[PDB]
């Protein structure tokens, strides 16, 4: 789900 990508980015940047 393309929609989930930015959540993953946010997480791995944290």
């Amino acid at each position, epitope marked *: *789900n393309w*929609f*989930d*990508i*930015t*959540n993953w*980015l*946010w997480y791995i*940047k944290k």
Partner: antibody
Amino acid sequence: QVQLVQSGAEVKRPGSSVTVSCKASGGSFSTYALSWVRQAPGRGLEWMGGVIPLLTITNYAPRFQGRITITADRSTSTAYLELNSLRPEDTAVYYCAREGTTGWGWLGKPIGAFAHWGQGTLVTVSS
Amino acid sequence: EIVLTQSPGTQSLSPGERATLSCRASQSVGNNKLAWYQQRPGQAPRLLIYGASSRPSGVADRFSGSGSGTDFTLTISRLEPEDFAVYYCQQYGQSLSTFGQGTKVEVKR
């Protein structure tokens, strides 16, 4: 606060290509999903596609796959919608929309749903 | 493709009355990724509910979302004059996001 400012209304000839711009300020441009949604006169909302600027990853609705291009320019925090081979039924208000965040400022966890909307751009396909 | 059905497409209700708006999905909506938007003529849509039941700050708490799977509901506890408007549901549980065709809540007189 996130603000999305779109380019002005444009009349386009049938068969031509239109580029609509969406300049963002506030929050993060590169790490949040930017989508385009259109609304034909007197009709409902239709999601066209989106881009995640940092990763240069696009996602187009099948109905527009092959007729649209969405790009993002990080130097100007501007996203662009290209729609090609225009027909009268492409006459619509085109909106750019960015996903919201939780919190707590404008740099929090993304929510996917579209919290932030541009003012819309009327594209009129006509001779 | 997930088809979202908003029926009826219009509701005629009295000022102050409770409103319940249905949004049914043709298949289960992943992770309850279901949003509701309000739109008034000449204005951009506005996010009211995301994740089926979460309400952004600033949105009046007379708006509440509920449901899961295929069956979603927007409830307006008491219709204020500004609540007469069009409401869209949207699913974003698949890469192909789709909207319902909207329900116009208008004033019964």
